[PDB]
Design an enzyme around this catalytic site. Structure first.
Site, PDB file in Angstrom:
ATOM      1  N   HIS A 108      -3.055  -3.744   7.797  1.00  0.00           N
ATOM      2  CA  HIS A 108      -4.062  -4.059   6.742  1.00  0.00           C
ATOM      3  C   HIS A 108      -4.777  -2.786   6.332  1.00  0.00           C
ATOM      4  O   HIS A 108      -5.060  -1.914   7.166  1.00  0.00           O
ATOM      5  CB  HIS A 108      -5.072  -5.064   7.317  1.00  0.00           C
ATOM      6  CG  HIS A 108      -6.513  -4.952   6.880  1.00  0.00           C
ATOM      7  ND1 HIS A 108      -7.019  -5.541   5.710  1.00  0.00           N
ATOM      8  CD2 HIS A 108      -7.583  -4.300   7.475  1.00  0.00           C
ATOM      9  CE1 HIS A 108      -8.364  -5.253   5.620  1.00  0.00           C
ATOM     10  NE2 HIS A 108      -8.731  -4.474   6.707  1.00  0.00           N
ATOM     11  N   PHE A 109      -5.132  -2.626   5.065  1.00  0.00           N
ATOM     12  CA  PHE A 109      -5.892  -1.455   4.579  1.00  0.00           C
ATOM     13  C   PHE A 109      -7.385  -1.796   4.573  1.00  0.00           C
ATOM     14  O   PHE A 109      -7.849  -2.693   3.862  1.00  0.00           O
ATOM     15  CB  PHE A 109      -5.480  -1.174   3.114  1.00  0.00           C
ATOM     16  CG  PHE A 109      -6.022   0.208   2.744  1.00  0.00           C
ATOM     17  CD1 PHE A 109      -7.297   0.378   2.232  1.00  0.00           C
ATOM     18  CD2 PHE A 109      -5.176   1.281   2.941  1.00  0.00           C
ATOM     19  CE1 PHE A 109      -7.821   1.625   1.886  1.00  0.00           C
ATOM     20  CE2 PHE A 109      -5.723   2.502   2.594  1.00  0.00           C
ATOM     21  CZ  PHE A 109      -6.984   2.744   2.086  1.00  0.00           C
ATOM     22  N   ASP A 110      -8.196  -1.062   5.302  1.00  0.00           N
ATOM     23  CA  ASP A 110      -9.600  -1.340   5.455  1.00  0.00           C
ATOM     24  C   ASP A 110     -10.488  -0.697   4.436  1.00  0.00           C
ATOM     25  O   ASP A 110     -11.304  -1.368   3.799  1.00  0.00           O
ATOM     26  CB  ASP A 110     -10.120  -1.098   6.873  1.00  0.00           C
ATOM     27  CG  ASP A 110     -11.261  -2.078   7.227  1.00  0.00           C
ATOM     28  OD1 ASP A 110     -11.069  -3.293   7.095  1.00  0.00           O
ATOM     29  OD2 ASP A 110     -12.384  -1.731   7.624  1.00  0.00           O
TER      30      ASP A 110
ATOM     31  N   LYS B  84      -5.220  -9.998  -7.639  1.00  0.00           N
ATOM     32  CA  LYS B  84      -5.890  -9.344  -6.480  1.00  0.00           C
ATOM     33  C   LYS B  84      -6.892  -8.340  -7.086  1.00  0.00           C
ATOM     34  O   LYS B  84      -6.450  -7.506  -7.871  1.00  0.00           O
ATOM     35  CB  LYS B  84      -4.837  -8.569  -5.679  1.00  0.00           C
ATOM     36  CG  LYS B  84      -5.331  -8.288  -4.273  1.00  0.00           C
ATOM     37  CD  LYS B  84      -4.327  -7.592  -3.371  1.00  0.00           C
ATOM     38  CE  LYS B  84      -5.035  -6.876  -2.235  1.00  0.00           C
ATOM     39  NZ  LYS B  84      -4.085  -6.360  -1.222  1.00  0.00           N
TER      40      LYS B  84
ATOM     41  N   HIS C 205       0.775  -1.221   0.000  1.00  0.00           N
ATOM     42  CA  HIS C 205       0.000   0.000   0.000  1.00  0.00           C
ATOM     43  C   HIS C 205       0.810   1.275   0.000  1.00  0.00           C
ATOM     44  O   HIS C 205       0.106   2.304   0.010  1.00  0.00           O
ATOM     45  CB  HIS C 205      -0.907   0.017   1.285  1.00  0.00           C
ATOM     46  CG  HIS C 205      -1.907  -1.149   1.239  1.00  0.00           C
ATOM     47  ND1 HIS C 205      -2.968  -1.269   0.379  1.00  0.00           N
ATOM     48  CD2 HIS C 205      -1.910  -2.275   2.053  1.00  0.00           C
ATOM     49  CE1 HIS C 205      -3.632  -2.461   0.631  1.00  0.00           C
ATOM     50  NE2 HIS C 205      -2.957  -3.090   1.667  1.00  0.00           N
TER      51      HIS C 205
END
Length: 124
Positions: A119-121, A41, A12
């Site tokens: 983690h990217f939410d 992905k 990210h």
């Protein structure tokens, strides 16, 4: 193996660009960060900020993750981001993405010591 914190930076972070420069940004960044190795992905966001300002979000507004967990935090300010989503013509190993540049707050989940994003939410 690769740590969760390191995986978050690989997937990210993009401190080296201020914004996506053309419609191919997602196609090249997806490939180059190895996000298309085993399969395409379908969605992934890049953040165009210094790593220190993104790590600081773990000390900002605590909120519930999309899945219910409570170790999520939302940026007080907006950030420059690029949203990458798979296209209709995407076909493994030739994964194809659509590039969307925008300015929004980010929501991440944090863990460990030091307490950092893993983690990217979502972007809101």
């Amino acid at each position: 193996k690769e740590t969760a914190a390191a995986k978050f930076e690989r997937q990210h972070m993009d401190s080296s660009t201020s914004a996506a420069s053309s419609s191919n940004y997602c196609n090249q960044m997806m490939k180059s960060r190895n996000l298309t190795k085993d399969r395409c992905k379908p969605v992934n966001t890049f953040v165009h900020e210094s790593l220190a300002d993104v790590q600081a979000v773990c000390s900002q507004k605590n909120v519930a993750c999309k899945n219910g967990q409570t170790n999520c935090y939302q940026s007080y300010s907006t950030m420059s981001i690029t949203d990458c989503r798979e296209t209709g013509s995407s076909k493994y190993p030739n994964c194809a993405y659509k590039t969307t540049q925008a300015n929004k707050h980010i929501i991440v989940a944090c863990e460990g010591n030091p307490y950092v994003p893993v983690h990217f939410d979502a972007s809101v």
